[PDB]
């Protein structure tokens, strides 16, 4: 059987690696993959064109395509493949777009009582000022007309909070501003699987969004991940009965069949767990920490999801833990320095090494992109995982490598 993994980072290399373990798979293809994935699949120099890839896959005789990153989904890759009659693990454009909008997320915590961060939007000041007194402080003031994370302010003042909103609504004639309640509690990730009817959550994990040790510095796409993240069973049960279950129920209401990964980012509060954001794919490096612990045959699992037969399965995991540590390039995430020639020696038993941005400029291997390498500790104990992993990073030849050192700390602390 021929399988196609779409992406260019560790998550894809990870998926490409787990797919292999399947006895059904004959050949593997990475589009576009990277220098690291060349050892498991034939690299496909994709240009991002969705229908193009579809056609190629059709021509090539691909039997199942696993989509890693998000953009291809919102760009309709699933849509394009189905048209060609191909099996693509992943939601369709319309489904992915609805499932990930904040608008929808709201309609759920309005029609299903989904426990989520209490926020609201405004365009006129006097409005947004009577809302602050309501939520309290800290409070987050983000420049809505700036969809990207920039402009955000975590105010500790009603004093500074106002100065935050007023600033935006007096830049000349601009516009929108969002005021969202700041929740206390550790953040965690609950990835899940779904075919429209059934939703199976995987082992809860914990990402380290922050670039620097101390959950400090600029927000990044994930400096690391550990799994499973120590979470009370009543909480995980709360999460699937209050968050997961209704998501599905509300997703079918909008008239769409969502089949694929469901990323549920969330804060764990005393009030309970609260969704922060929904996504339509395995997060990175979330994937790199879970896939080695997953027992099921990834191909077999995928098929169920895409064909809508998830109800007849049961995720099984190993008896241990995994910790992924990102080894980003100096300059990440603002302006990553490229080319950095690096050397990565064979890892000892208990340490898997995934590539998230590596290229071959001839015979040698070089860095390419923000995050470059992935070291994943495998232990039957989180510490062991973390120890093997950090015990290895110093062997890697990535001079100037930016890598947090406290990945796993919050977890180890129960």
UniProtKB/TrEMBL annotation:
Source taxon at top rank: Bacteria
Domain ATP-grasp: 106-307
Pathway given in the UniProt record: Purine metabolism; IMP biosynthesis via de novo pathway; N(1)-(5-phospho-D-ribosyl)glycinamide from 5-phospho-alpha-D-ribose 1-diphosphate: step 2/2
InterPro entries assigned to the protein according to its UniProt record, in alphabetical order: ATP-grasp, ATP_grasp_subdomain_1, PreATP-grasp_dom_sf, PRibGlycinamid_synth_ATP-grasp, PRibGlycinamide_synth, PRibGlycinamide_synth_C-dom, PRibGlycinamide_synth_C_sf, PRibGlycinamide_synth_CS
MF GO annotations: ATP binding; metal ion binding; phosphoribosylamine-glycine ligase activity
Keywords noted in UniProt: ATP-binding, Ligase, Nucleotide-binding, Purine biosynthesis
Signal peptide positions on this chain: none
Required cofactor names: Mn(2+); Mg(2+)
Gene3D superfamilies assigned to the protein according to its UniProt record, in alphabetical order: 3.40.50.20, ATP-grasp fold, A domain (3.30.1490.20), ATP-grasp fold, B domain (3.30.470.20), Phosphoribosylglycinamide synthetase, C-terminal domain (3.90.600.10)
Cited Pfam families: GARS_A, GARS_C, GARS_N
EC number: 6.3.4.13
Reaction equation(s) it catalyzes: 5-phospho-beta-D-ribosylamine + glycine + ATP = N(1)-(5-phospho-beta-D-ribosyl)glycinamide + ADP + phosphate + H(+)
GO terms classed as biological process: 'de novo' IMP biosynthetic process; purine nucleobase biosynthetic process
PANTHER family membership: PHOSPHORIBOSYLAMINE--GLYCINE LIGASE (PTHR43472), PHOSPHORIBOSYLAMINE--GLYCINE LIGASE, CHLOROPLASTIC (PTHR43472:SF1)
Family: Belongs to the GARS family.
Matches recorded under NCBIfam families: purD (TIGR00877)
Name the UniProt record assigns to this protein: Phosphoribosylamine--glycine ligase
Source lineage: Bacteria, Thermotogati, Deinococcota, Deinococci, Thermales
